[PDB]
Amino acid sequence: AAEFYKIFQLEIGEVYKHPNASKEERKRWQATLDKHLRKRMNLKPIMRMNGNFARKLMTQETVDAVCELIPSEERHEALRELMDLYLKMKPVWRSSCPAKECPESLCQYSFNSQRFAELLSTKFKYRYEGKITNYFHKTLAHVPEIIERDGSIGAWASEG
């Protein structure tokens, strides 16, 4: 979700049309996103991101509120489908027992991963060519093997 914050922060300025930008433009995008977040979702800017911020910003209303700052309807649809895919994927690895708490999300995880992969490769070409983050690689590749090997993922987390 911190990387999604960065994605919104970069896309609010329409980087896909302007490949080059200055740190002043980056700070402008920072300020606009932070203001609109505090105005609509009642959040605050935080220096290093935490779990409560992650859960709040991984909501459909996050994109439903940030689309007002970007003009492109194609970008609106792309962000909406990206958020939908991530929210479908989250219960698989956050469930305390995915075999008896989200079988519908477990049965189509591979198809959702393929759709997310193709969307990242095509519609967000400006960031994910030759560089993909560790956590997206893990989430898109190794989750079904982990759930088949162990039985659950969220039970073995470090929140305790």
Given the rule CB under 7 A, which residues bind DNA? 42, 50-52, 55, 90-91, 94-96, 101-102, 154, 159
For DNA, the closer of residues 95 and 113 by Cβ is 95
The nearer residue to DNA, 31 or 155, going by C-beta atoms, is: 155
- Asked if 85 and 116 touch (Cβ cutoff 8 Å), the reply is yes
What is the closest distance, in whole angstroms, from the C-beta atom of residue 57 to DNA in the complex? 12
Compute the distance between CA of residue 66 and CA of residue 9 in angstroms, rounded to an integer.
Answer: 10
Looking at the Cβ atoms of 148 and 159, the one nearer to DNA is 159
Round the CA-based radius of gyration of the chain to a whole number and report it.
Answer: 17
CB closer to DNA out of 14 and 101:
101
Q: Which is nearer to DNA, 64 or 101 (CB)?
A: 101
Q: Which residue has the tokens 């800017």?
A: 45
Name, in order, each residue with C-beta under 8 angstroms of 64's C-beta and a sequence gap of 6 or more: none
* Token pair belonging to 94: 């956050």
Q: How far is the CB of 52 from DNA (least distance, A)?
A: 5
Under 8 Å CB-to-CB from 17, ≥6 apart: which residues? none
Q: How far is the CB of 129 from DNA (least distance, A)?
A: 30
Distance in angstroms (rounded) separating the CA atoms of residues 160 and 155: 9
Distance CA 144, CA 113 (A): 11
